[PDB]
Amino acid sequence: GSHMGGPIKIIDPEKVSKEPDALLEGFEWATLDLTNETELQELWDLLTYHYVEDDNAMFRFRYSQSFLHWALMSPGWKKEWHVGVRATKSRKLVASICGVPTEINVRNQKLKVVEINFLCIHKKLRSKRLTPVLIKEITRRCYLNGIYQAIYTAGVVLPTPVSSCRYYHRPLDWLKLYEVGFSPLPAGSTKARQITKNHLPSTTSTPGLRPMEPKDIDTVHDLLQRYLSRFALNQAFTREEVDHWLVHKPETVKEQVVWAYVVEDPETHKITDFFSFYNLESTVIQNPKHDNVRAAYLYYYATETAFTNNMKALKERLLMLMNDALILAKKAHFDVFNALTLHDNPLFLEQLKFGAGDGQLHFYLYNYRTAPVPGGVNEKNLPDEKRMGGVGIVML
Numbered sequence: 001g002s003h004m005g006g007p008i009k010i011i012d013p014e015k016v017s018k019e020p021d022a023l024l025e026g027f028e029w030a031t032l033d034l035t036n037e038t039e040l041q042e043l044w045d046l047l048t049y050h051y052v053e054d055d056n057a058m059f060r061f062r063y064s065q066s067f068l069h070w071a072l073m074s075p076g077w078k079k080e081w082h083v084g085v086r087a088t089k090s091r092k093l094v095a096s097i098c099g100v101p102t103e104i105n106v107r108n109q110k111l112k113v114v115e116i117n118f119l120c121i122h123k124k125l126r127s128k129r130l131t132p133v134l135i136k137e138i139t140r141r142c143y144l145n146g147i148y149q150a151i152y153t154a155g156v157v158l159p160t161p162v163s164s165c166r167y168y169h170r171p172l173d174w175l176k177l178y179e180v181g182f183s184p185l186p187a188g189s190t191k192a193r194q195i196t197k198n199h200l201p202s203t204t205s206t207p208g209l210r211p212m213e214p215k216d217i218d219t220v221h222d223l224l225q226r227y228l229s230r231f232a233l234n235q236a237f238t239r240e241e242v243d244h245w246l247v248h249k250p251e252t253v254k255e256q257v258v259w260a261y262v263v264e265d266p267e268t269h270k271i272t273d274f275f276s277f278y279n280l281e282s283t284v285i286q287n288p289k290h291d292n293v294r295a296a297y298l299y300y301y302a303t304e305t306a307f308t309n310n311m312k313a314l315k316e317r318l319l320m321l322m323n324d325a326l327i328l329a330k331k332a333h334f335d336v337f338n339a340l341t342l343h344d345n346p347l348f349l350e351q352l353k354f355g356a357g358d359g360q361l362h363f364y365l366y367n368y369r370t371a372p373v374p375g376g377v378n379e380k381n382l383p384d385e386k387r388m389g390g391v392g393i394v395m396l
């Protein structure tokens with residue numbers, strides 16, 4: 001045993017069944033080959049019309065083939081972790097659950113895990129308890145390949161979250177967000193006044209800031225590992241993951257999904273900071289004027305300033321950098337910039353006019369117990385500088 005936590009069940013891979021369990025009559029297992037446009041496009045269609053985490057929302061995600069490729073074919077990916085269910089007689093894809101491999105540090109300990117997402121069941125098949133069946137089959141496939149833990153997030157509370165982080169939203173085009181009914185008009189205020197309140201300039205302020213290039217990978221990999229190692233729960237990137245997750249490839253990528261910038265110090269020419277964000281659009285269900293909201297999501301970032309252990313200095317450096325990330329998202333035509341209260345986010349959220357959203361994201365670990373980790377928020381569910389150092393991993 002151990003007073004530090006660790007696995008719940010020890011698994012012998014040689015004792016795991018090599019055949020899957022039987023599904024409901026009329027249905028069969030499928031392994032998706034996402035390198036085939038036809039199957040990619042079946043998955044796109046199931047998610048487009050059935051992946052609605054909250055039917056109460058006024059927006060739905062709108063995927064691109066590029067976002068799907070970026071999200072599901074990361075380094076080490078295996079086709080057998082893209083699991084589907086088909087109707088035998090029509091061949092129609094009606095459920096999915098997918099995993100990709102990586103490594104995370106959970107307090108003292110490094111673990112190989114899969115990140116699980118895109119769990120989705122067609123509306124016609126809801127409430128048949130298919131979920132535990134999907135979960136048990138991708139588990140079996142991971143166990144056979146030597147992976148016995150997983151990490152996932154959900155908007156709903158399930159047994160023992162390791163952490164919870166609150167949604168925050170910085171309007172970039174306030175007038176459009178007011179028109180789609182995302183933002184109300186405050187008491188006593190006018191449109192002109194909210195437009196003025198949320199206005200940003202068109203030029204950045206941090207000297208040396210430019211888009212990340214392939215030749216930066218090694219230095220950003222190293223800055224990012226040292227930066228993330230300040231958090232209890234963090235992702236342990238390899239150099240190939242930095243390449244896949246952070247560096248846009250225009251020859252390869254139809255629609256840019258990820259924006260990464262570095263600051264190359266002008267005096268020294270060393271990279272001292274970087275930040276990145278990704279693009280995921282939302283369709284607006286019922287609106288006379290707009291069809292979509294283009295949302296940027298804050299992803300990974302780092303700064304050398306964090307290692308002077310001067311918190312005040314770190315805060316100022318992030319206010320400057322994150323203000324320029326807002327300016328750059330706004331120039332690339334995003335409507336809203338989303339962030340969570342993880343990493344060192346509580347240092348800048350409020351000051352940069354991010355507003356509290358109505359929603360929380362919970363982190364879970366499968367087959368592993370560890371003490372809970374602070375999610376950047378206090379008792380009142382507001383951001384709190386004393387509640388950081390916990391969650392150093394972002395999920396798509």
Ligand SMILES: CCCCCCCCCCCCCC(=O)CSCCNC(=O)CCNC(=O)[C@@H](O)C(C)(C)COP(=O)(O)OP(=O)(O)OC[C@H]1O[C@@H](n2cnc3c(N)ncnc32)[C@H](O)[C@@H]1OP(=O)(O)O
Pocket residue numbers: 050051052053054114116117118119120121122125126127128129130131132135138139142143147148149150152153154155156158366
């Ligand atoms: C070693 C490797 C191990 C690998 C596996 C590790 C574990 C993975 C766990 C899954 C992780 C999902 C993460 C994401 O994809 C992000 S979260 C994105 C989640 N996707 C969607 O929201 C898509 C839109 N909605 C749907 O399709 C969804 O309706 C459904 C698939 C989420 C649920 O389908 P369903 O309504 O037909 O329910 P059911 O009859 O099949 O079974 C219900 C049981 O499932 C568990 N149930 C309901 N919602 C759940 C959820 N979000 N996560 C987990 N369990 C859930 C519940 O706790 C419940 O339990 P009980 O009744 O027994 O108490």
Ligand SMILES: Cc1c(COc2ccc(F)c(F)c2F)oc2cccc(OCCCNCc3cccnc3)c12
Pocket residue numbers: 051059061117118166167168169177182280281282293294295297336338339340357359361395396
């Ligand atoms: C989700 C989400 C929201 C609420 O959504 C929007 C709010 C305002 C908008 F203008 C908008 F377009 C939103 F989508 O605000 C957030 C703030 C921070 C982080 C957020 O989500 C992080 C997790 C996103 N997972 C997206 C995903 C992943 C896999 C499959 N399909 C969708 C969110």
